[PDB]
Amino acid sequence: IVGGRRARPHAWPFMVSLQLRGGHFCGATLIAPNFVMSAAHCVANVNVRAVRVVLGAHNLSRREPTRQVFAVQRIFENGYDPVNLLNDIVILQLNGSATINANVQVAQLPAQGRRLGNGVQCLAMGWGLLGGIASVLQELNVTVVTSLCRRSNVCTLVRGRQAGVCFGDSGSPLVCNGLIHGIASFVRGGCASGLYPDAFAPVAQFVNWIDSIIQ
């Protein structure tokens, strides 16, 4: 996240770090005790057997006993298209089930088909590049825009300065009005261009599918 701020510790208890031999590579969102959702591009070409799913994290540089760590048992796909960067969503089934507590909570999702208007105020977040990789979870106020955005995405733009998501924020939730409406998918013009909005997989278009998998 470029131009954001440190989150209060454990402010976003559904926020997940996907890791490979102890190194963050993507965000995800806890959507049931034994499932997270992230971007399909996050696990393209990746050794899924090596992926660790880290719940209840705040500062990745620290040892944090609040953390719970799982392996990925299975992935569920929904028509990811890497050429057009469409349907950029995956569900990762965990090899066990999270202990749900203050620091580890399931996210709330929108209704299937909900579409955000121009002007909706959201929070983006993640441990991605700060302009290297963040140690402390970052959050950022953004505004939904339809200009320079396809109908098949939800896009956001920070007004009046250069700020936005960046590499390693891939897969992270966009929270609007308390609900997870986006999964960070792609940037154009480099991170924080101030020109192209950031694009997210539109979670509300995939809710019936998510529901069918997670119960």
Ligand X SMILES: *[C@@H]1O[C@H](CO[C@@H]2O[C@@H](C)[C@@H](O)[C@@H](O)[C@@H]2O)[C@@H](O[C@@H]2O[C@H](CO)[C@@H](O)[C@H](O)[C@H]2NC(C)=O)[C@H](O)[C@H]1NC(C)=O
**Catalytic residue list:** 41, 88, 170
Compute the least distance from the CB of residue 65 to ligand WQQ, in Å.
30
- Interface characters, 156-175, with ligand X (x: CB under 6 A): -------------------x
Which residue among 2, 155, 163, 176 contacts ligand X (CB under 6 A)?
176
Q: Which does 184 bind (CB under 5 to 8 A by kind): ligand WQQ, ligand X, Cl ion, none?
A: ligand WQQ
At residue 29, φ and ψ (nearest 5 deg) are -130, 130
CA distances (Å), origin 100, targets 42, 85, 107, 183, 185? 25, 33, 11, 22, 27
Q: How many residues are listed for the chain in this entry?
A: 215
Q: Which does 84 bind (CB under 5 to 8 A by kind): ligand WQQ, ligand X, Cl ion, none?
A: ligand WQQ
Compute the least distance from the CB of residue 82 to ligand X, in Å.
30
Closer to ligand X by Cβ: residue 7 or 91: 7
Written as six digits, the tokens of 64 are 């944090």
Q: How far apart are CA 137 and CA 215, in angstroms?
A: 29
90 interacts with ligand X by CB under 6 A: no
The letter for the amino acid at 37 is: M
Q: How many other CB atoms sit within 10 Å of the CB of residue 209?
A: 16
Q: After which residues is the chain broken (C to N over 2.5 A)?
A: 131
Nearest residue relative to ligand X (C-beta): 141
Region near Cl ion per CB under 5 A, out of 43-51, 55-63, 123-131, 207-215: 43-51
Binding site for ligand X (CB under 6 A): 121-123, 141, 175-178
